[PDB]
C-alpha cells in the first residue's frame with residue numbers, strides 16, 4: 325500500500341550499484357578475443373564419453389567464467405558496506421555466490437529469440453550444446469535455461485537487476501560466514517532499497533515482483549548445488565586442470 329520515496333542514501337546505493345555494474349559488465353563483449361578459442365567438436369549425439377574425452381568448449385568457457393568471476397569480485401567490492409566486512413567473510417561470500425551471480429548477470433546476454441547467450445558473432449553464441457561440450461549435462465543446463473527465461477520475463481529494470489546481484493552476494497546464510505549479523509544488516513539495507521524501489525516504480529505488481537525476485541535467489545541455490553556436483557565430476561577428468569584457470573580451480577575446488 326504505502327509507497328515511500330527512496331531516501332537520499334537509497335538513491336546513493338542504487339547509483340553506486342549501477343555505476344559498479346556499468347564498469348564491470350561490458351555489453352559489447354570486446355574482451356572475448358582474449359579468451360582461449362571456442363572449439364565445437366561434432367557431438368550431435370550428446371555423447372558423455374566424447375564430451376569428457378574432448379572438453380572442447382571448456383578452455384573457452386572456463387576463461388569466460390574466470391573473467392566473469394574477476395568482474396564480479398570488482399562489482400562486489402563496490403557494493404556499499406561490503407568493505408565493512410572482514411576479508412575472511414568477503415572471500416567466503418564471493419566464492420559461494422560467484423556462480424550464482426554469473427548466472428544472474430548472464431541474463432543480459434541471454435536472448436529468448438533462440439534461447440542462447442549471444443555475445444556478438446556466432447563464435448561467441450552459446451547454446452545448450454556448447455555447455456554440454458564443456459562437460460556439463462542437461463541436469464544443469466535445462467534448469468538454467470528455464471531460469472534465464474523466468475528471469476527474463478520479469479523484465480527487471482537495471483536498478484532491480486544490480487540490487488538483486490548485490491543481495492545475492494551479501495547473503496548471511498552462506499556456510500562459513502563469521503559475522504552473519506553484519507552481513508544480514510547490509511543485505512537488509514539492500515533489500516529495503518529494492519523493496520522501496522519496486523514500490524516507487526511499480527504499483528501494488530510490486531509485491532508480486534519482489535516475491536518473484538526472492539524466489540529466483542532460492543532457484544540459484546539449487547542451480548549452485550547442481551553445478552558443484554557436476555564440477556566435481558569434471559575435475560576427475562585427467563588434464564582438466566589445464567583447461568580451467570587458477571581462479572576457477574580455487575573458487576569451485
Ligand SMILES: C=C1/C(=C\C=C2/CCC[C@]3(C)[C@@H]([C@H](C)CCCC(C)(C)O)CC[C@@H]23)C[C@@H](O)[C@H](CCC)[C@@H]1O
Pocket residue numbers: 348349350351353382385386388389392426427429430431432433434441443450455458460464551555572576
Ligand atoms: C559468464 C557470462 C556470460 C554467459 C553465461 C553463460 C553462457 C555459457 C555457459 C555458462 C558459463 C554456464 C555454465 C554452466 C558454467 C560452467 C563453468 C565451469 C566450466 C567452471 O563449470 C553458467 C552461465 C552460462 C556472458 C555475459 O553475459 C557475461 C560476461 C561478459 C560481460 C557473463 O558473466
